[PDB]
Symmetry: C5
Subunit: 394 residues, 5 copies
């Protein structure tokens, strides 16, 4: 009875094109906020943030007022899209192919004319994703909202603190906060200023998954490259191991290229770490070729230089704690014995070249072990958020 009479009365002469102010010279105050339900996806490669959000817009409609004593039991009415005036607030940095992603719900109006409007949506927003410290990164994504066609002389947009009480945590991103800021900017289109409300989502990447799939495996595979310096040269498998480990490390290189955006702003931390590991494994292969040159050195070729025999066989080795008929028969027997003596001298020269290969192999093991530790620790601990990451995620 009374609900049916109130709806009929309220729409008499109501024009949804009219900004509902009693005084046309005064701007209308609109309070804007949001509730963050969930961070659905962070697309680093496309530089897009997907969120599940409830916008909250409240204002006063001067015309949608009634005396509740004359309509007993009718405290609120509801209006769908296009039947009541609404603010045209949009996300400026929308990345959605439709631009506007809001699902239009009802406007709730109470007897004094206060209007609530809480449309939900899955919002896709353009966000600069800084991968300088990936995977120990903190991202600051901005959601910029404003009335598209109403400047500050017509619509006084005010801000209210974002709601996070219903937020559902993402397994990958720790929410730090969503502070808001209300600004008033001039655009070359228009002489009137246009206020906006910008919410910045400060989120922190949880690093367990990337430690498991990116960091740890690289550490262990680099460790196996160091085994080349232990494999005896006579196994004939030194090169196989080294080059095979290097060719497997490109799998992680190509993995990183697929996830990171193709930007030139900085070299990502993970890229530095992987590039430095692969360069150390590449240099180990170079060193292995030199070690094989000494082990297979032709005895009848050159002679161990003086500097080789002192630097390696003396200094480095110490430091490493390594350390008539009867006359014819005589002529033939003496030839056979001298041939053996000559072979003994040649094999003693070969043994000296093989010792040099072992020493260089032993010196390189230690040197390359030190380079790996320093590079690994130095690169990883340069990240401002590394200590916090290991504390919370491991």
């Amino acid at each position: 009875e009374f609900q049916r009479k109130l709806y009929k009365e309220l729409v008499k002469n109501y024009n949804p094109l009219e900004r509902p102010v009693a005084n046309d010279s005064q701007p209308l105050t609109v309070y804007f906020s949001l509730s963050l339900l969930q961070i659905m996806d962070v697309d680093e490669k496309n530089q897009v943030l997907t969120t599940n959000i409830w916008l909250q817009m409240s204002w006063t409609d001067h015309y949608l007022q009634w005396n509740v004593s004359e309509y007993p039991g009718v405290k609120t009415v509801r209006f769908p899209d296009g039947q009541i005036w609404k603010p045209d607030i949009l996300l400026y940095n929308s990345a959605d192919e439709r631009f506007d992603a809001t699902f239009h719900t009802n406007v709730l109006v109470n007897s004094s004319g206060h209007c609530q409007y809480l449309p939900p949506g899955i919002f896709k927003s353009s966000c600069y994703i800084d991968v300088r410290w990936f995977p120990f990164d903190v991202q600051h994504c901005k959601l910029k909202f404003g009335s598209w066609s109403y400047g500050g002389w017509s619509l006084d947009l005010q801000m209210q603190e974002a709601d996070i009480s219903g937020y559902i945590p993402n397994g990958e991103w720790d929410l730090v906060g969503i502070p808001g800021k209300r600004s008033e900017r001039f655009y070359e289109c228009c002489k009137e200023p246009y206020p906006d409300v910008t919410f910045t989502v400060t989120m922190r990447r949880r690093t367990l998954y990337y430690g498991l799939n990116l960091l740890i495996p690289c550490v262990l595979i680099s460790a196996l490259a160091l085994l080349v310096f232990l494999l005896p040269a006579d196994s004939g498998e030194k090169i196989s191991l080294g080059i095979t480990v290097l060719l497997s490390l490109t799998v992680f290189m190509l993995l990183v290229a697929e996830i990171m955006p193709a930007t030139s702003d900085s070299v990502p931390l993970i890229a530095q770490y992987f590039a430095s590991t692969m360069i150390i494994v590449g240099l180990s292969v170079v060193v292995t070729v030199i070690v094989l040159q000494y082990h297979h050195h032709d005895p009848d070729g050159g002679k161990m230089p003086k500097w080789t025999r002192v630097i390696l066989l003396n200094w480095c080795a110490w430091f490493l704690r390594m350390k008539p008929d009867l006359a014819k028969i005589l002529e033939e027997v003496r030839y056979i014995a001298n041939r053996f003596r000559c072979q003994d001298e040649s094999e003693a020269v070969c043994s000296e070249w093989k010792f040099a290969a072992c020493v260089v192999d032993r010196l390189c093991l230690m040197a390359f072990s030190v380079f790996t530790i320093i590079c690994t620790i130095g690169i990883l601990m340069s990240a401002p958020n590394f200590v916090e990451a290991v504390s919370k995620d491991f």
Copy 2:
């Protein structure tokens, strides 16, 4: 005749904006339920559940009533979207880019004013997918439904048990149940409580496919890594086999990373199993380098330590059940025979180092076989649903 007259009469003054209650102070009772037709997809990486569902909403429209004696043969009428008042029930945790995925069908009304509305849809809902026990996991996905703009003072939302009579089984997921719960929550937006109806789909993953593509292949490939400890050192192929098996096991590592969500909540069971298998294969390569160091040990270098010759060549070996002219001619002939004697001593020292490599190789085979069995069985049987999985799926 009568159908045409009833439709004309029913819409006289009908306002689709009006909640159809006789008494405006009383809330309207709405019964909500669903029929689950099919679980279409579970996206673990995006944390989304796709379902084919028929929502069921029933209420009473006070105005859509008629005397069937005055309209003989007209027991029901039908109204499309926007011509009859409807409840604005939505899925709160929708992940669909349009948010609302319901296909709007007719409302069926009978002569006493009871309204049925059974809109179908393909629903995408945000679901926390716990991969702690993957692939022996049980997921609990929630579908939360509620009126968006009508609080409990206007719309009394009641629940009815979900229908599963037309459910078509998914080859990958066994449906355990879909219990519902009716709650009444307060939101900071509004002083009025808002009831919701939450259906939790309890589903169990069928594990045959993952046993075939993930578990079994890992077991067999780990088994082939143990063959290194049987390959004679003189084949010159020990390292090739080991490192090749390790480099193939990253294929499964990268396979798992592609399917699992990048979350830091827990280390998945499958990750533990694969990480522990690869670490055992990596340690086997380390042990192989030590075995090759003993087999290729230079006889003129150090001497088998005392502890090496007792621990290995005695204890472990037992346990493993392994076990003037004529004078010149004399001088030259004696040199040739002593050179042979010296070679015999050196090769007997080399044979002793080769036996040590064999023993260490034999001890490591047994030890690594035991580590594989224990790790494999221990990790797999820690899953609460492992026994049930093998009973039903294998």
Copy 3:
């Protein structure tokens, strides 16, 4: 003139909400059929069938009738969506994100009131895809159509044989038939039965492409694994070949996993075939390790057991048709000659162990060749449609 007058007359008091029957107590007869133009896609992994179809719905509108003598030259009229009553027939097992995929075209009405309505669409339907016999599989996909809101008391849905006269063959699927069945089911929603018309598309997979990309390559690569048993042990490349062939066969394993649905209903035929080939190649590697143990057997170690020397060197080999100063000088010369004699005995023992490796290698070649043929032929010919496939596709 007359076309303009007929349209004006026909819509006078026409209500598109009214089921167009003269007698409101009688159900309306609707004839339903379809024309299958093309099978666009079969998504085995998502279990979805995409088709290009023209629905055909015909009924009688009691009100859309006229005397053609009073409107000379006007034999038919046309009405778009929402201006004429239409049946609300939907595909029940739609997999489309919009659910309803029909493109709404005109309804054609002739002077006696017979209405034709032939809306086209690209339909996505949920279909159980049985991969038990893949790639020699026959699929039966169901298209279930019915009025959503009109039960059998209001709408008498009848079936007509599907049209295939304009069907364009798919290169991958041979159409067997599209029989239809008209049923009448009860639903817990409603006390009234709801008739449906189900068209089952029986399609047969053409197997040339999969024979070329899956079967043939597996056969040939398995054949190359058998070459290990021919490679002399002294080449030092037996393990490289075997393990390399095994590591390449996982490419096909991972290929199959990507195309097949992750279901636990059955082990696909192709999975059996590939799993059995890889297991045979894996066992060949195991056998190769045993062959290398005999070839590299230390002569001073154990002695060929009695059972080894009879089973292999005798039986299997036959079957395989394999088959004072002068005294000191004497003491030194005799030592040199006895050392040679001892070496000859040791190398004759080594030659006997190498012959055993060759025999075991020759016995294993034949045995593994037989296992490959039996497994390959036995698995492939277990498929009920294998004979037909080779007849028609190869």
Copy 4:
């Protein structure tokens, strides 16, 4: 003034449901054509053609006529969708999920009632893509247009030559032509014929990119397989090279499978070329195993058959232009010299087996070089468009 009066007058009693003919018995003539702007994509795997096209439809509206002298300055008017009668022309073989992809623009009408309507769109059409001669293929894709609900008794559809003056060339496809054909077909739905206009896009694939990424790399990698026949057997790397080259050639095999449709109509040219190259590389590995059997042949085993020593060591080799105390001391010295003589005989038998391996290796190099050239040239030049391709693209 006059524009405002003309629009008001023109819509008085205008019914957009009415086919705008003065005489209702006569069909309306509609001229149909298109402008091809760009070939956007050819999806061979999904068998879909995407084009950017401007449809052109012109007819006469009997009612939209005016005297320009009474409306000075008003030569044309414009009407949007749904306000003026339009032809319902659709693409029959649309592959778009929405079916109709036309963006509805204005209809332009001039004072004599001639109507122009030029709606643009991105059209996706089902096209049989014949991959028999890929990548030297010429495709003929059909765009079939017709009125959906107006047969030839109501709508006389006529054709006009397609416009290509604004066509932008695709880097991958050379446009040969777009001839049109106007037909009149009967459908089982309807006793009336329905005319259609079919435009066939004849396009030719430009082959530089595929020559660079598919053909050339296969040629060079096959060439490297022939190097096995030059590698000395004593390098111990013959098998590594051959099997490694074969395992890399599956990369191109799997590349081709990903781009080609999974059809059984024919074996694509590129598949023949790659399959024949891999089979030649596979046979080279088989031949390498036989060459290693001769090189490692045990001297104490069988004896070079008579046919082996003539066919290879004589004929093929020529063609290839290859080519008391003192008595005891005597007994021991004579044993040492006879042992050397026996070793010399055995190594001379081994040298003869090694020469056979070299000859077979040299004969196989030439034979396999000839098979590669013949197969490569023979397969590639069987394509009717190969000569034109190399002329225009290389």
Copy 5:
């Protein structure tokens, strides 16, 4: 009060179909411009540019004028889509499946009748992407805008300089400029000219990411191929290293094929660079086979040709700075000594062939190092933008 009266007055007799000119014979002037907010994506493979743009259209509506003194405080009004006449300006080279991607916002009108309309959108436009100099490329993408149905006699389209003041830089593309050009073209459809406004986005690719993921890794891996010429032949690992490096370089080849469009207009710079590196690595493998032929040369076979012993062992080597009872006993002892002498001659011939392999190996190292440097530097510096790229990006 006054806002409500103005809206009611303004729509009295307003026809949105009417071009709002006072004089129907005169064309309406429309000013068109845009603001470029962000370059979202450049799809080289699909040849599509995605941008976030605000179109700016301004004109004068003769009818939407009022005296502000009679409506105090009402300086502007707003109208949504379909209520006010608007220009139908579209992007001609749209690649969006919907064609028109504009999100329709309000039109702002002030008291003198000046209309502003600034609709935003995510625009996808077809763009020829020239990959001749990739990754040192500069792209010129065109955005062509024009009224679809209003020719130059009705709509006088004028241009204004594009706004870039709010442009947000892309990490991958440096914006050079967005100049505009206003043209007037004739189309075969129509005798009237149709003006357009074309904005050309000149953008430059930032090359740090591609230098890191494409160029640098290729340089280093090619460098490791040169190590083969240092590995002693007796290591038995020369072929493994070379062929393994070649088989890894196809990873980058296949990477490039995936990103580049499949066009035949030119061979991309990156393709030249990678193809030339792989050909040099392939030739190194060929040279390695020749080096192994000399190292393993049978001493009893042919004799080092005269030209081989001078060109290599003399010239190249210098340049490279390489450098009764007693009678029987005599007969047997002399046989043993002559056999040793003969072996010494054979091994001295073998040492001469091994020296030739070393020299050829040393000459090839230098030659191949020079080819790598020349090819690398020559190809990279042929790009007109290479110098600028290294200056700004590295």
